[PDB]
Design a protein around this ligand. Sequence first.
Ligand SMILES: O=C(O)c1ccc(Cc2cccs2)cc1
Length: 260
Amino acid sequence: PKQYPIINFTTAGATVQSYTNFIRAVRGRLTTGADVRHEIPVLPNRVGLPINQRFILVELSNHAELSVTLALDVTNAYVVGYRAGNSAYFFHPDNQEDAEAITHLFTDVQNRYTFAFGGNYDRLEQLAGNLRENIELGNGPLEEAISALYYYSTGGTQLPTLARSFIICIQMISEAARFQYIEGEMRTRIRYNRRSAPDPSVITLENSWGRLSTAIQESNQGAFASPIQLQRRNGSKFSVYDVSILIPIIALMVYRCAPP
Ligand SMILES: O=C(O)c1ccc(Cc2cccs2)cc1
């Protein structure tokens, strides 16, 4: 339709309800082409997906009324790049096909840049000089991340702050879309007007998203080949035998194959 779907969100006067509707809307657009036949939605297969269905845009704004737009890949719900003003910035794609795909984003803009680095946490934590466990999430942090992303395009933001801001945005949007549990953790932060880094329960879920997507889609009648290990709020390890307990926790999965 000329442009990809746009969801708007603002930190200005943000409430639990407004964040909830925002995440609801993002999931909606992510799952237009999803396989919703089983207990957990499966995002469209990367292979053969027409380019006009490949991305969604998330436009973020704050009290300062600065605006940036993130591009998310519908196949994994992950941020691939963003726009601020007349410039767009992309994470380093892993292959030639992904590199072609992003040429279809933000075609309007004068200035296009591809970072040397990918958008995985390991690398972003390195650039930020900060682990996820010491980077606070909440409305306040998201407000500041929006400003920092905007001012990267004017020379006002240094790369470590940019990376820290991506880590914030990805967790509060992509991971909240992927995980009802993480969305809920954000709702609590918004309710009580607090900012705090994610505990190990949030972090291991984020790290386990691909593995969980795999174990679930390769399960025998919903029971797992081998158990997957997660962490509680206090760091203690437990394991999960079957999908039952994960249906309320994971909202979307990356396409995975299945056995012979
Ligand atoms: O006991 C806890 O603190 C705890 C246990 C499990 C999780 C992850 C899940 C929450 C609901 C189902 S699995 C988080 C925190």
